[PDB]
Design goal:
Length: about 375
Amino acid sequence: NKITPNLAEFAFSLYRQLAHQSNSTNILFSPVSIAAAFAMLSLGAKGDTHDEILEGLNFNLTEIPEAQIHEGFQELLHTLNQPDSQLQLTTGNGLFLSEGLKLVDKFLEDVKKLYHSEAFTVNFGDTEEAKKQINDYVEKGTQGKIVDLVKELDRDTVFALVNYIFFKGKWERPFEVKDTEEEDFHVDQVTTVKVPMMKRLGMFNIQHCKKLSSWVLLMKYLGNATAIFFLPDEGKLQHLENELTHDIITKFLENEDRRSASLHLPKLSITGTYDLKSVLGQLGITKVFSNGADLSGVTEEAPLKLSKAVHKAVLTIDEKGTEAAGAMFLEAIPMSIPPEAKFNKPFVFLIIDQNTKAPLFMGRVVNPTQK
Ligand SMILES: CCCCCCCC(O)C[C@H]1O[C@@](CO)(O[C@H]2O[C@H](CO)[C@@H](O)[C@H](O)[C@H]2O)[C@@H](O)[C@@H]1O
């Protein structure tokens, strides 16, 4: 089990970037979805463009040969897609290539082999049809969670890359709908609304960490998955965010001490949309997003470069479990206007696959959106 330790650090790194831009908006993204897409793309990149990408994903070529990295992803992806009898989890990569655009064989085979990618040739001259195919791919993979992902597509498009992840799990310790109650929340500084709050009194695998300055709760999903929640102490949100690390989570995953407690978890339906260019730029990956981008490993008759890279994720939480989807489109997609209002006691969460110890999703909940 390799590359998962890097994937984890990549998560926190990316999380911290989004976290220090605002502290009053909900956050949600899939490290796996983002890492798989850029890792696969690097196979067609060269020089700095290439090195910046793998390095920006928390990979150092001096510690692990590139061959093993692309290899670690191939196995990770194979393991994540292995059918689990108790939960649903799937990830897929798709390439939509322009008919008439000459490509590099080596690239087509590296992706299909290493990232189990699917290659589709489409006519981008028929923009409505090209979008439909892409959108049908994501909607099929996200089981209806994300439909009509791409609203507009450039006429001159010749290459498109999309990644999707889907997860649905049931709490081993579910809540009771009868115990859910409407509660007051300040939508703005001057008006409140009632939102559904789930409640349950019993034994929980809770604990408190000094280094993180917060309470840590573990919510197992039937299957090989788990959800860890972090409730920062007063004024210690920023502290939690910067202190989260792979090891810490490890020291907490090996604690079977459960105590009695009254859990209050709001019914949630959150989303997250981000143009990763600036954010990933902050991690060292900038060349591929510039004109000096070298992706001559994809095609030799087009000056490929990433102009935009939007990540979209949706997560629903209720009494019985969790359902979440994520998609990565390496092009333009509209941004949303998240509502900004902190209900004083925000929390961070991380959804993890016990089989590979990989972080499927990570977020921050400050607003009880029901969207
Ligand atoms: C790791 C723990 C994760 C649990 C996170 C719970 C977040 C909330 O739901 C917080 C929210 O619930 C209320 C309800 O009154 O607070 C109660 O529950 C929290 C649970 O931690 C208690 O600490 C509070 O004392 C309770 O009042 C909201 O007021 C609160 O903001």
